[PDB]
Write a protein that binds this ligand. Sequence first.
Ligand code: NAG
Ligand code: URA
Length: 246
Amino acid sequence: DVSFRLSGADPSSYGMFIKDLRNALPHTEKVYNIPLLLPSVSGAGRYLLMHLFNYDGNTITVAVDVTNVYIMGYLALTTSYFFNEPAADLASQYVFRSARRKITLPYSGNYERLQIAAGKPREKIPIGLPALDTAISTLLHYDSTAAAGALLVLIQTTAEAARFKYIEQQIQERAYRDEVPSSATISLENSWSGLSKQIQLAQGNNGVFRTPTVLVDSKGNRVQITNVTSNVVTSNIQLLLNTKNI
Ligand SMILES: *[C@@H]1O[C@H](CO)[C@@H](O)[C@H](O)[C@H]1NC(C)=O
Ligand SMILES: O=c1cc[nH]c(=O)[nH]1
């Protein structure tokens, strides 16, 4: 399991949690020095448990699929909650079985559906460590519209930070003041599967992407990523989604 406490949190302690999260995801090889997530994992070993604690010390446990860093569902006191999607229903066969009741949320976990449920796109939702405190608090008691927004915060400040060093650093900058994600943040989140794929295809193609990936940069300008020498590949991305799952 991995844990993170908001009470006393600072950029250092958040970076320790993101490191723990990355290190809890199994891999058998690296591709261009980046851990390659596994094609498949059977049974309960598929799911990582993240223990998150708000400022007041209340807690949820979040179940994460280790093949793709997707959040499946979470436990809050004696109730489990899962996305309305087949991978999450499968997860509910293995995790949080001792909950008194299981609620299926009235959406799946992709950004498009969550944003519809929340009533707003994530361009307009501030993120940060204070926002993660708020999200944990919201998830403690069911409210499906509030939960969608909380879950957009939670996914960005855990999974997306684990995937991209730039996103981890953006959350660090928001340790004590929330701010809506930079355009580059959104770009990276949206490009993870594409990038993971192109990096794996570049092996066999001299480091060259078969199809270039369009991104927005740290300055807000629209760059084109064509090969493994790019900083996105050498410095930024930390985990690859296996092409077997693309
Ligand atoms: C590869 O990417 C680098 C870094 O972004 C860029 O300067 C260069 O033009 C690209 N090289 C090739 C061979 O496509
Ligand atoms: O796209 C998805 C679907 C489920 N859970 C996630 O974190 N992301």
